[model samples]
Target: GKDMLSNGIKYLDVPYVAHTLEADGPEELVINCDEVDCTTLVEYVLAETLTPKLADGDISESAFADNLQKIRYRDGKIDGYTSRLHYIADWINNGVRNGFLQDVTGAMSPDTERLSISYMSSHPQLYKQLANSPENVAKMKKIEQSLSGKEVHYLPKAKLPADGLPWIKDGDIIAITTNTPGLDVAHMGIAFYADNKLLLVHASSTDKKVVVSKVPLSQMLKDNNKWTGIRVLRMKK
Candidate 1:
């Protein structure tokens, strides 16, 4: 779960951004903050390059979820989360194919629940091998590609609608799952306000990897959508 709270432990190679608001720095670290730069040229430029306008391209291991590097705590040291999009991409793709998202989200506020993508299935009989052998993990992940509807993560309940960010005003994109099908349910999507219109983005788990696709905002928010809410990261003094 993405909402669990825990004490901070010092690691050797872990790149901790003490000042998240400062987005400009060495290319190896990520600054965590709430001020999303929607108007900046860099933002728009990157957005346009990655946006799934014509057709979904080979996102592969280049996405953020896939790129998180290995953080090893050995020899009294830790490997920082460098620009290891390839490592993270491979891991999450495996997680999706195997049906279990491992340690990814670092930490969060007291009110949030850890968001996770796991292979917890509606049919328990289908997941018996995940506990028995590593081979089962691969089997489950392969099973995810064909199934139309499957629960990837559970979104926490929101007290107020305005408290969370909205992605789109009235657009609903197709949600693909590894296994099972929930039609308008079983997957997750996000909504935010942009260009005086609702915008939607969904971190899709497809082909054993994760992709954050920007969709029409209004359509995504329609009928209360799939996910309850997204984890909001903030600046810490």
Candidate 2:
């Protein structure tokens, strides 16, 4: 799988670091490329890949930042610390609403269910913003209520079939579904296929850098008892 190709493959060894979630200072659009978290890595690849298609043929930092903001913040605007899409479900929902992403999980898997993600609201002290201010905690509560009962589609690890593996393309986004109560997902990665096996390319915390898992996705899911399955997404071109 290491030799496989993907829009994310170029970041094979980039370190995993993220500053976008910092709540100490006023919220700013921090664009750090020397390192990235799983989510940031996805944003970089998607934005950079789309940069060349600018109508004015302007592919500079100005234009590139536009696409990154579109992916990083709600309505493509960074209004405050709360504006960022902290959860993968919320990110996917906003992307679909904005017509930039398509939730293709259902097309590949029949497993679907209703879920309510309240991790941030429940564990307030865990978040600097939610803990730092009653203001942000209230906002977090509202965000949870806004998405209280939505249909979440996923490829349950138990339901993996021979036919389903082929449907996952090289550049598809993969959100590893989780069993953690009140949390929608755990890890974020890109879907990749190599030698007829579907793999996950992600900024690995354990590896301290980006890597295409040596193990197939199915096996990886099985091995990681904490991870449940995957919610697949594809950017609309």
Question: TM-scores of the models, in the given order?
Answer: 0.26, 0.90
lDDT of 2 by residue, 92-177 (tens): 88888998788888776778867778999799888877777888878878888887688877888877643246667778888988
Which regions of candidate 1 deviate over 4 angstroms?
Answer: 1-110, 113-134, 137-192, 195-198, 203-226, 233-237
Q: For model 2, what is the alpha-carbon lDDT of residue 121?
A: 78
Which digits, one per residue and each the tens of the lDDT, describe model 1 over residues 1-237? 111010011111123222232234323433221222211111112222232333455333334222221211111122322212111223233433433333112232234232223333333353332344455455444444333233333124343243233421222222212112322224433233445543433332232222232444333334344434332211111
Candidate 2 Cα outliers beyond 4 Å, as residue runs: 1-5, 18-20, 53-58, 161-164
**Looking at candidate 1, what is the lDDT of residue 108?**
26
How many residue pairs collide in each prediction? Answer: 46, 0
RMSD (Cα, Å) for all candidates, in order, is 16.6, 3.1
Error (Å) of candidate 1 at residue 52 is 21
